[PDB]
């Protein structure tokens, strides 16, 4: 996405926040997808964790 | 939960608690790590 | 706590160090003529000996035992 | 104004070049290559040290044989022996007389000194040389920065950006193969890991200190114990680390060429004075003084008064300064004949101030550039008497 | 019998030479250089990575100036600004209107990805190449040992002592200067530590990941925030690590010459098939069979039956074996024309047994040494049809 | 967007309406963004008002 | 509130501007050699490019 656009809903109001940021997702590999598939080989990508510890 | 000045807060520059700084679309897995000024 | 050999007697000559020398114990002396021609020397000295060193223009260094290394301008 | 300058590699003496920027006042350099520590590319090939025949305690079967096996210990020498009658505290104890069997086993192991007192081989490549170059620059008056030699590296420590080398004098005083010991470094053709003949250097050859595996050609040969007594004849060469400490060769910090010192530290070879270094600096333009603010000094006169044909700055020369304003005036001899102690001279309104220098030609006909005013300080010099102290400031010997 | 042998550097194929010791029975080799991992001498010069403009929160003095100072942060860009009216949650808050001052400050810092996702420069020297050489030797039938190339190193793993190289083909596929990224290795003329132009590769240049100091030429230029609102315009080149990931060059494991593969591991360049290696082995004499125990095979005959002029071992030839005893008989073609799949052939009393081979000359006139009995297996060969699979066993192309 | 697609929610039904129309947003400037940022220079764009008067 | 492209990297040569350049988005660069010979140039730049 050209931008990033964030927001919750308190309940009385939308109350969001939005920003510019150049985003892309190349997967690691000589394939230039636009999105991760369900299958294919695994290989060493860079990525953030689920966790807090 | 910090509050800062969101740049295009729906209308224009408000002061949202979820003011977005440090967008990081630098990984590969479809993922972005974001910081709101809000501490959920 | 360690060794030390008695100081040398430095004597000048024309591009030449005469050194009347007189140790306590066998002392490994050695030098390095600092030209790209090294021309070093080694000799354990226990008997007191007047020695000689053809010093060059750029310099020589001199190692009276574990006494620190000396250095010399002989223009 | 990026002042390129070929520059002799020599450690303990400044190189006070002069910035001739067209348009603003020139500024002197003071480039003292305080160090020339080298740090070639290397590889720890194997530590060696003296063995310790840490004998495992032999077996003694009393009636019949005990076949030995070749355990994987380094140089695991083991040989069965019969025909004993082992006196152990009660006379003998095994009641047979020829079926009394004794199996001696001994392997080689790193000494405890191997960790600490140990020679150390290396395959030594060339790497990249360094220096803590002081420049007490201009009016900046200080930067003591660690730099490189590769001719695109800056080091913006202080305010100036400076690019050094690559030097032309690629003599690595280290040879390809080197042994190292504590501080005495030996450019020795160590045989190799895995091969060293017993007695010769590297009878023990461990990759490192931790490495449980090694190569121990010690020619360890067990012999049978004598006359029915418990012990272990181990017949062995004392180490090629024992010798190599008293039948060795001399150290490279005592036999090298072209003027180097050594450390068991990053494996540098300090202060190797040889050849030249093409050095180039980008000064901060703020440090420049514009030309219209320094006094113009022309219509002057220079003359020696007591020129000393020598190394120490014995050469002197008054200069009939003929200034316009009054202030400082950086100085330099663009000719390398004369090396000057003063970078800068203060000036009143057209006074006179002697400086110090040193030369190598009997008739020093060197120009002197007193802040954009050249002058020949022609004259004649006198030889000294007293030549036994460290190294010169002259370093300009040529045809004279 | 220390069997010297020049030997082609090529990874995945044995080299079944033959030990012609005068006096005892010969023994075949099977030398398969399973790997050619290189590991040159190198130096970590600087990690780079994409910056993060981790802005420290600006000062806002409400009535009058706040002079900034040049803090020592890497690329510490700071610029005072006046003429604001900063809307912060209550409209503005500073009651002045021009004396409202805003001091923006921003420095460059390593990303969190710098630790993990980071290019990596090197000054690369030559070092020393290695291999896990299998020899399924003779009747030993096994040793898979890691060795060196320097032509005095043995490796007594198994029972045989073997000395390799030095190889003549000194093409380090790595250039002098190299950048490295995760696994893709780029023989790139990285500018240097301390210099890299902003936007270009190495805008951030940290010695290592831990190194708090760095060089950040990012052209970071702060601009004044707009229309009396709190924020920090940081105008900056996205990194030369951002590009260099999508306007880069291709990897050396995809552009190298003479057949190499790469790893971000000890920085080896595996399996570089080029040139020859002068290899020499000292076999254990115990492994030899004495000559008077293998059958003498002479008064034989050899002929091809279906020679395939090819790479895979398609060439075949019956041999009218004429033995004396019955048993095994190691085989080899001392001429390099023919490469044989069988090292050893079993023999009854003068039977016949075909072997497999491969050649490159239409008329293969190659000798065959069946355990001290030479023979020409002259004939003619046929071209194949089916050439799209990995690399050959023939590797003997010459004038034909 | 290649199209335009409008709709409220009465509450019992979605009840939307959609249409074709070629849409783009060039910002005024020699930069061909896809979206307005948070910062940058101000310069004379064309735009509709918030207001009714 | 409007656009802005990241600053250029000015590089000197003899009567020649090398410009290593690196935008955010496609940027129309253009010039005017102020001689009566105009000799202008136009090119949208989205891919980072060293120009002259």
Short mmCIF file of N, CA and C in Angstrom, two decimals, chain E residues 175-317:
data_model
loop_
_atom_site.label_atom_id
_atom_site.label_comp_id
_atom_site.label_asym_id
_atom_site.label_seq_id
_atom_site.Cartn_x
_atom_site.Cartn_y
_atom_site.Cartn_z
N UNK E 175 36.17 -11.25 -5.58
CA UNK E 175 37.05 -10.14 -5.88
C UNK E 175 37.72 -9.68 -4.59
N UNK E 176 38.52 -8.63 -4.69
CA UNK E 176 39.14 -8.06 -3.50
C UNK E 176 38.09 -7.53 -2.55
N UNK E 177 37.19 -6.70 -3.07
CA UNK E 177 36.12 -6.10 -2.29
C UNK E 177 34.83 -6.86 -2.54
N UNK E 178 34.13 -7.19 -1.46
CA UNK E 178 32.93 -8.01 -1.53
C UNK E 178 31.91 -7.44 -0.57
N UNK E 179 30.66 -7.46 -0.98
CA UNK E 179 29.53 -7.26 -0.10
C UNK E 179 28.81 -8.59 0.02
N UNK E 180 28.20 -8.80 1.18
CA UNK E 180 27.58 -10.06 1.53
C UNK E 180 26.23 -9.76 2.17
N UNK E 181 25.23 -10.57 1.83
CA UNK E 181 23.87 -10.32 2.28
C UNK E 181 23.16 -11.66 2.47
N UNK E 182 23.16 -12.14 3.71
CA UNK E 182 22.30 -13.24 4.08
C UNK E 182 22.76 -14.55 3.49
N UNK E 183 22.59 -14.70 2.18
CA UNK E 183 23.26 -15.74 1.41
C UNK E 183 23.77 -15.26 0.07
N UNK E 184 23.21 -14.20 -0.48
CA UNK E 184 23.62 -13.70 -1.78
C UNK E 184 24.86 -12.84 -1.61
N UNK E 185 25.95 -13.26 -2.24
CA UNK E 185 27.25 -12.64 -2.09
C UNK E 185 27.54 -11.84 -3.34
N UNK E 186 27.96 -10.60 -3.15
CA UNK E 186 28.14 -9.65 -4.24
C UNK E 186 29.58 -9.17 -4.21
N UNK E 187 30.30 -9.41 -5.31
CA UNK E 187 31.69 -9.00 -5.44
C UNK E 187 31.77 -7.53 -5.81
N UNK E 188 31.23 -6.71 -4.91
CA UNK E 188 30.95 -5.32 -5.18
C UNK E 188 32.05 -4.43 -4.64
N UNK E 189 32.41 -3.42 -5.42
CA UNK E 189 33.33 -2.39 -4.98
C UNK E 189 32.56 -1.46 -4.05
N UNK E 190 32.34 -1.95 -2.83
CA UNK E 190 31.73 -1.10 -1.83
C UNK E 190 32.61 0.12 -1.62
N UNK E 191 32.04 1.32 -1.42
CA UNK E 191 32.88 2.52 -1.42
C UNK E 191 33.94 2.47 -0.35
N UNK E 192 33.53 2.49 0.92
CA UNK E 192 34.38 2.23 2.07
C UNK E 192 33.55 2.49 3.32
N UNK E 193 34.01 2.03 4.47
CA UNK E 193 33.58 2.63 5.72
C UNK E 193 33.88 4.12 5.70
N UNK E 194 33.00 4.89 6.31
CA UNK E 194 33.30 6.27 6.57
C UNK E 194 33.03 7.24 5.45
N UNK E 195 32.56 6.78 4.29
CA UNK E 195 32.49 7.62 3.09
C UNK E 195 31.18 7.57 2.33
N UNK E 196 30.40 6.51 2.46
CA UNK E 196 29.38 6.18 1.48
C UNK E 196 28.36 7.27 1.23
N UNK E 197 28.23 7.68 -0.02
CA UNK E 197 27.34 8.77 -0.36
C UNK E 197 25.90 8.40 -0.04
N UNK E 198 25.15 9.38 0.44
CA UNK E 198 23.78 9.14 0.86
C UNK E 198 22.94 8.68 -0.32
N UNK E 199 22.10 7.71 -0.06
CA UNK E 199 21.33 7.04 -1.10
C UNK E 199 22.11 5.91 -1.70
N UNK E 200 23.38 6.14 -2.00
CA UNK E 200 24.22 5.07 -2.49
C UNK E 200 24.41 4.03 -1.41
N UNK E 201 24.93 2.88 -1.83
CA UNK E 201 25.19 1.79 -0.91
C UNK E 201 26.11 2.26 0.21
N UNK E 202 25.82 1.80 1.41
CA UNK E 202 26.61 2.21 2.55
C UNK E 202 26.36 3.64 2.97
N UNK E 203 25.11 4.09 2.94
CA UNK E 203 24.81 5.37 3.56
C UNK E 203 25.00 5.27 5.06
N UNK E 204 24.54 4.18 5.65
CA UNK E 204 24.89 3.80 7.00
C UNK E 204 26.07 2.85 6.91
N UNK E 205 27.06 3.07 7.76
CA UNK E 205 28.26 2.25 7.76
C UNK E 205 28.68 2.09 9.21
N UNK E 206 28.29 0.97 9.80
CA UNK E 206 28.70 0.59 11.14
C UNK E 206 29.73 -0.51 11.04
N UNK E 207 30.77 -0.40 11.86
CA UNK E 207 31.83 -1.40 11.88
C UNK E 207 31.25 -2.79 12.11
N UNK E 208 30.46 -2.93 13.16
CA UNK E 208 29.70 -4.14 13.40
C UNK E 208 28.33 -3.74 13.92
N UNK E 209 27.59 -4.74 14.40
CA UNK E 209 26.26 -4.47 14.90
C UNK E 209 26.31 -3.80 16.26
N UNK E 210 27.24 -4.24 17.11
CA UNK E 210 27.40 -3.66 18.43
C UNK E 210 27.92 -2.23 18.36
N UNK E 211 28.67 -1.89 17.31
CA UNK E 211 29.39 -0.63 17.26
C UNK E 211 28.44 0.56 17.30
N UNK E 212 28.45 1.27 18.42
CA UNK E 212 27.57 2.43 18.56
C UNK E 212 27.96 3.54 17.60
N UNK E 213 29.25 3.67 17.32
CA UNK E 213 29.71 4.63 16.34
C UNK E 213 29.48 4.09 14.94
N UNK E 214 29.35 5.00 13.98
CA UNK E 214 29.15 4.61 12.60
C UNK E 214 29.43 5.82 11.72
N UNK E 215 29.11 5.68 10.44
CA UNK E 215 29.13 6.78 9.48
C UNK E 215 27.79 6.80 8.78
N UNK E 216 27.05 7.89 8.95
CA UNK E 216 25.72 8.04 8.38
C UNK E 216 25.70 9.29 7.52
N UNK E 217 26.16 9.15 6.29
CA UNK E 217 25.87 10.14 5.26
C UNK E 217 24.54 9.72 4.68
N UNK E 218 23.47 10.29 5.21
CA UNK E 218 22.13 10.12 4.69
C UNK E 218 21.56 11.40 4.10
N UNK E 219 22.29 12.50 4.16
CA UNK E 219 21.79 13.79 3.72
C UNK E 219 20.51 14.15 4.48
N UNK E 220 20.48 13.76 5.75
CA UNK E 220 19.35 14.07 6.60
C UNK E 220 19.27 15.57 6.80
N UNK E 221 18.19 16.17 6.31
CA UNK E 221 17.97 17.61 6.40
C UNK E 221 16.60 17.85 6.99
N UNK E 222 16.58 18.38 8.20
CA UNK E 222 15.32 18.73 8.83
C UNK E 222 14.75 19.98 8.20
N UNK E 223 13.43 20.03 8.09
CA UNK E 223 12.71 21.21 7.65
C UNK E 223 11.74 21.63 8.73
N UNK E 224 11.30 22.87 8.65
CA UNK E 224 10.47 23.40 9.72
C UNK E 224 9.08 22.77 9.64
N UNK E 225 8.46 22.46 10.76
CA UNK E 225 7.09 21.95 10.70
C UNK E 225 6.14 23.04 10.23
N UNK E 226 5.04 22.59 9.66
CA UNK E 226 4.13 23.46 8.94
C UNK E 226 3.06 24.04 9.85
N UNK E 227 2.73 25.31 9.58
CA UNK E 227 1.49 25.96 10.02
C UNK E 227 1.21 25.76 11.51
N UNK E 228 2.24 25.90 12.32
CA UNK E 228 2.08 25.84 13.76
C UNK E 228 1.52 24.52 14.23
N UNK E 229 2.18 23.42 13.87
CA UNK E 229 1.82 22.10 14.37
C UNK E 229 3.10 21.36 14.76
N UNK E 230 2.99 20.55 15.81
CA UNK E 230 4.10 19.75 16.29
C UNK E 230 4.31 18.58 15.35
N UNK E 231 5.46 18.56 14.69
CA UNK E 231 5.99 17.37 14.04
C UNK E 231 7.40 17.71 13.60
N UNK E 232 8.04 16.76 12.93
CA UNK E 232 9.46 16.84 12.60
C UNK E 232 9.63 16.44 11.15
N UNK E 233 9.63 17.39 10.24
CA UNK E 233 10.04 17.07 8.88
C UNK E 233 11.47 16.60 8.87
N UNK E 234 11.67 15.33 8.59
CA UNK E 234 13.00 14.80 8.29
C UNK E 234 12.99 14.43 6.82
N UNK E 235 13.81 15.14 6.05
CA UNK E 235 13.94 14.92 4.62
C UNK E 235 15.23 14.17 4.41
N UNK E 236 15.12 12.99 3.82
CA UNK E 236 16.21 12.04 3.87
C UNK E 236 16.10 11.10 2.69
N UNK E 237 17.24 10.65 2.24
CA UNK E 237 17.30 9.60 1.26
C UNK E 237 16.92 8.28 1.91
N UNK E 238 15.92 7.55 1.41
CA UNK E 238 15.80 6.15 1.82
C UNK E 238 17.08 5.42 1.48
N UNK E 239 17.35 4.35 2.22
CA UNK E 239 18.72 3.92 2.32
C UNK E 239 19.23 3.31 1.03
N UNK E 240 20.55 3.38 0.88
CA UNK E 240 21.27 2.54 -0.03
C UNK E 240 21.33 1.09 0.37
N UNK E 241 20.71 0.73 1.48
CA UNK E 241 20.35 -0.64 1.78
C UNK E 241 18.94 -0.97 1.34
N UNK E 242 18.08 0.04 1.16
CA UNK E 242 16.76 -0.20 0.60
C UNK E 242 16.88 -0.53 -0.89
N UNK E 243 17.37 0.42 -1.68
CA UNK E 243 18.03 0.01 -2.90
C UNK E 243 19.27 -0.74 -2.50
N UNK E 244 19.80 -1.53 -3.43
CA UNK E 244 20.72 -2.65 -3.21
C UNK E 244 19.93 -3.89 -2.81
N UNK E 245 18.61 -3.79 -2.62
CA UNK E 245 17.75 -4.95 -2.52
C UNK E 245 16.75 -5.05 -3.66
N UNK E 246 16.57 -3.99 -4.46
CA UNK E 246 15.71 -4.07 -5.63
C UNK E 246 16.23 -3.30 -6.84
N UNK E 247 17.42 -2.69 -6.76
CA UNK E 247 18.13 -2.19 -7.94
C UNK E 247 19.58 -2.65 -7.89
N UNK E 248 19.79 -3.83 -7.33
CA UNK E 248 21.10 -4.37 -7.04
C UNK E 248 21.73 -4.97 -8.29
N UNK E 249 22.81 -5.72 -8.06
CA UNK E 249 23.37 -6.63 -9.03
C UNK E 249 23.14 -8.07 -8.60
N UNK E 250 23.50 -8.97 -9.49
CA UNK E 250 23.19 -10.37 -9.30
C UNK E 250 24.26 -11.05 -8.45
N UNK E 251 23.95 -12.20 -7.85
CA UNK E 251 24.90 -12.82 -6.93
C UNK E 251 25.94 -13.69 -7.58
N UNK E 252 27.07 -13.73 -6.89
CA UNK E 252 28.24 -14.44 -7.36
C UNK E 252 27.98 -15.93 -7.47
N UNK E 253 27.04 -16.46 -6.69
CA UNK E 253 26.57 -17.81 -6.94
C UNK E 253 25.61 -17.89 -8.12
N UNK E 254 25.42 -16.78 -8.83
CA UNK E 254 24.70 -16.75 -10.09
C UNK E 254 25.46 -16.02 -11.19
N UNK E 255 26.65 -15.46 -10.92
CA UNK E 255 27.43 -14.80 -11.97
C UNK E 255 28.91 -15.16 -11.95
N UNK E 256 29.34 -15.99 -11.00
CA UNK E 256 30.76 -16.30 -10.93
C UNK E 256 31.23 -17.02 -12.18
N UNK E 257 32.54 -17.03 -12.43
CA UNK E 257 33.09 -18.01 -13.37
C UNK E 257 33.56 -19.30 -12.73
N UNK E 258 34.01 -20.21 -13.60
CA UNK E 258 34.66 -21.49 -13.30
C UNK E 258 34.02 -22.28 -12.17
N UNK E 259 32.72 -22.17 -12.04
CA UNK E 259 31.90 -23.15 -11.36
C UNK E 259 31.91 -23.29 -9.86
N UNK E 260 31.34 -22.31 -9.17
CA UNK E 260 31.42 -22.17 -7.73
C UNK E 260 30.02 -22.03 -7.16
N UNK E 261 29.90 -22.39 -5.89
CA UNK E 261 28.72 -22.13 -5.09
C UNK E 261 29.18 -21.48 -3.80
N UNK E 262 28.25 -20.88 -3.07
CA UNK E 262 28.55 -19.89 -2.05
C UNK E 262 27.72 -20.16 -0.80
N UNK E 263 28.22 -19.68 0.34
CA UNK E 263 27.46 -19.74 1.59
C UNK E 263 27.84 -18.59 2.52
N UNK E 264 26.85 -18.11 3.28
CA UNK E 264 27.08 -17.25 4.45
C UNK E 264 27.23 -18.18 5.64
N UNK E 265 28.43 -18.60 5.84
CA UNK E 265 28.92 -19.74 6.58
C UNK E 265 30.38 -19.29 6.56
N UNK E 266 31.41 -20.10 6.76
CA UNK E 266 32.78 -19.54 6.74
C UNK E 266 33.23 -18.74 5.51
N UNK E 267 32.33 -18.40 4.57
CA UNK E 267 32.58 -17.55 3.40
C UNK E 267 33.35 -18.34 2.38
N UNK E 268 33.00 -19.61 2.31
CA UNK E 268 33.58 -20.47 1.32
C UNK E 268 32.96 -20.22 -0.03
N UNK E 269 33.63 -20.73 -1.05
CA UNK E 269 33.09 -20.76 -2.40
C UNK E 269 33.26 -22.20 -2.88
N UNK E 270 32.22 -23.01 -2.66
CA UNK E 270 32.34 -24.44 -2.83
C UNK E 270 32.60 -24.82 -4.28
N UNK E 271 33.30 -25.95 -4.44
CA UNK E 271 33.18 -26.79 -5.62
C UNK E 271 33.67 -26.08 -6.88
N UNK E 272 34.63 -25.18 -6.72
CA UNK E 272 35.18 -24.42 -7.84
C UNK E 272 36.03 -25.33 -8.70
N UNK E 273 35.44 -25.84 -9.77
CA UNK E 273 36.11 -26.76 -10.68
C UNK E 273 36.97 -25.96 -11.63
N UNK E 274 38.27 -25.90 -11.35
CA UNK E 274 39.18 -25.26 -12.28
C UNK E 274 40.61 -25.71 -12.03
N UNK E 275 41.31 -26.06 -13.10
CA UNK E 275 42.70 -26.42 -13.02
C UNK E 275 42.92 -27.78 -12.39
N UNK E 276 44.17 -27.98 -11.98
CA UNK E 276 44.65 -29.25 -11.47
C UNK E 276 45.24 -29.06 -10.08
N UNK E 277 45.43 -30.19 -9.40
CA UNK E 277 45.96 -30.20 -8.04
C UNK E 277 47.04 -31.28 -7.98
N UNK E 278 48.30 -30.95 -7.67
CA UNK E 278 49.34 -31.98 -7.56
C UNK E 278 49.29 -32.78 -6.28
N UNK E 279 48.58 -33.89 -6.29
CA UNK E 279 48.26 -34.63 -5.08
C UNK E 279 49.16 -35.84 -4.97
N UNK E 280 49.55 -36.14 -3.74
CA UNK E 280 50.53 -37.17 -3.44
C UNK E 280 50.14 -37.83 -2.14
N UNK E 281 50.17 -39.16 -2.11
CA UNK E 281 49.71 -39.94 -0.97
C UNK E 281 50.81 -40.90 -0.55
N UNK E 282 50.89 -41.13 0.75
CA UNK E 282 51.69 -42.21 1.34
C UNK E 282 50.70 -43.24 1.89
N UNK E 283 50.53 -44.32 1.14
CA UNK E 283 49.63 -45.41 1.48
C UNK E 283 50.19 -46.16 2.68
N UNK E 284 49.37 -46.83 3.49
CA UNK E 284 49.94 -47.79 4.44
C UNK E 284 50.39 -49.04 3.70
N UNK E 285 51.66 -49.39 3.89
CA UNK E 285 52.22 -50.56 3.22
C UNK E 285 51.49 -51.84 3.61
N UNK E 286 50.89 -51.86 4.80
CA UNK E 286 50.08 -53.01 5.20
C UNK E 286 48.91 -53.22 4.24
N UNK E 287 48.35 -52.13 3.72
CA UNK E 287 47.23 -52.26 2.79
C UNK E 287 47.64 -52.88 1.47
N UNK E 288 48.92 -52.82 1.12
CA UNK E 288 49.38 -53.48 -0.08
C UNK E 288 49.22 -54.98 0.03
N UNK E 289 48.95 -55.59 -1.11
CA UNK E 289 49.07 -57.03 -1.29
C UNK E 289 50.36 -57.29 -2.03
N UNK E 290 51.10 -58.28 -1.58
CA UNK E 290 52.33 -58.63 -2.27
C UNK E 290 52.00 -59.20 -3.64
N UNK E 291 52.97 -59.07 -4.54
CA UNK E 291 52.70 -59.33 -5.95
C UNK E 291 52.43 -60.81 -6.21
N UNK E 292 52.97 -61.69 -5.38
CA UNK E 292 52.90 -63.12 -5.63
C UNK E 292 51.59 -63.74 -5.18
N UNK E 293 50.57 -62.93 -4.89
CA UNK E 293 49.30 -63.41 -4.38
C UNK E 293 48.13 -63.01 -5.25
N UNK E 294 48.26 -61.97 -6.05
CA UNK E 294 47.24 -61.63 -7.02
C UNK E 294 47.46 -62.45 -8.29
N UNK E 295 46.40 -62.86 -8.99
CA UNK E 295 46.61 -63.62 -10.22
C UNK E 295 47.30 -62.78 -11.28
N UNK E 296 48.24 -63.40 -11.98
CA UNK E 296 48.80 -62.81 -13.19
C UNK E 296 47.86 -63.09 -14.35
N UNK E 297 47.53 -62.04 -15.09
CA UNK E 297 46.39 -62.03 -15.98
C UNK E 297 46.79 -62.04 -17.45
N UNK E 298 48.08 -62.00 -17.75
CA UNK E 298 48.55 -61.83 -19.12
C UNK E 298 48.12 -62.99 -20.02
N UNK E 299 48.45 -62.88 -21.31
CA UNK E 299 47.91 -63.75 -22.36
C UNK E 299 46.39 -63.62 -22.43
N UNK E 300 45.92 -62.39 -22.30
CA UNK E 300 44.51 -62.04 -22.29
C UNK E 300 44.10 -61.48 -23.65
N UNK E 301 42.89 -60.93 -23.71
CA UNK E 301 42.47 -60.13 -24.84
C UNK E 301 41.38 -59.17 -24.38
N UNK E 302 41.38 -57.97 -24.94
CA UNK E 302 40.37 -56.95 -24.65
C UNK E 302 39.73 -56.46 -25.93
N UNK E 303 38.44 -56.17 -25.85
CA UNK E 303 37.75 -55.54 -26.96
C UNK E 303 36.50 -54.86 -26.45
N UNK E 304 36.21 -53.68 -27.00
CA UNK E 304 34.91 -53.09 -26.81
C UNK E 304 33.85 -54.00 -27.40
N UNK E 305 32.64 -53.81 -26.97
CA UNK E 305 31.48 -54.46 -27.54
C UNK E 305 30.38 -53.48 -27.89
N UNK E 306 30.19 -52.45 -27.07
CA UNK E 306 29.29 -51.35 -27.41
C UNK E 306 29.88 -50.11 -26.74
N UNK E 307 30.75 -49.42 -27.46
CA UNK E 307 31.36 -48.22 -26.92
C UNK E 307 30.45 -47.03 -27.19
N UNK E 308 30.16 -46.30 -26.14
CA UNK E 308 29.31 -45.12 -26.20
C UNK E 308 30.19 -43.89 -26.06
N UNK E 309 30.18 -43.06 -27.09
CA UNK E 309 31.10 -41.94 -27.25
C UNK E 309 30.62 -40.76 -26.40
N UNK E 310 30.71 -40.93 -25.08
CA UNK E 310 29.84 -40.18 -24.19
C UNK E 310 30.46 -39.95 -22.82
N UNK E 311 29.62 -39.44 -21.90
CA UNK E 311 29.97 -38.98 -20.58
C UNK E 311 29.65 -40.02 -19.52
N UNK E 312 28.38 -40.39 -19.43
CA UNK E 312 28.00 -41.50 -18.59
C UNK E 312 28.78 -42.73 -19.02
N UNK E 313 28.97 -43.64 -18.08
CA UNK E 313 29.81 -44.80 -18.36
C UNK E 313 29.10 -45.73 -19.32
N UNK E 314 29.01 -45.33 -20.57
CA UNK E 314 28.32 -46.12 -21.57
C UNK E 314 29.26 -47.05 -22.30
N UNK E 315 30.55 -46.72 -22.30
CA UNK E 315 31.53 -47.57 -22.94
C UNK E 315 31.71 -48.86 -22.18
N UNK E 316 31.69 -49.98 -22.89
CA UNK E 316 31.89 -51.29 -22.31
C UNK E 316 32.91 -52.06 -23.12
N UNK E 317 33.48 -53.08 -22.49
CA UNK E 317 34.45 -53.91 -23.18
C UNK E 317 34.62 -55.20 -22.41
#
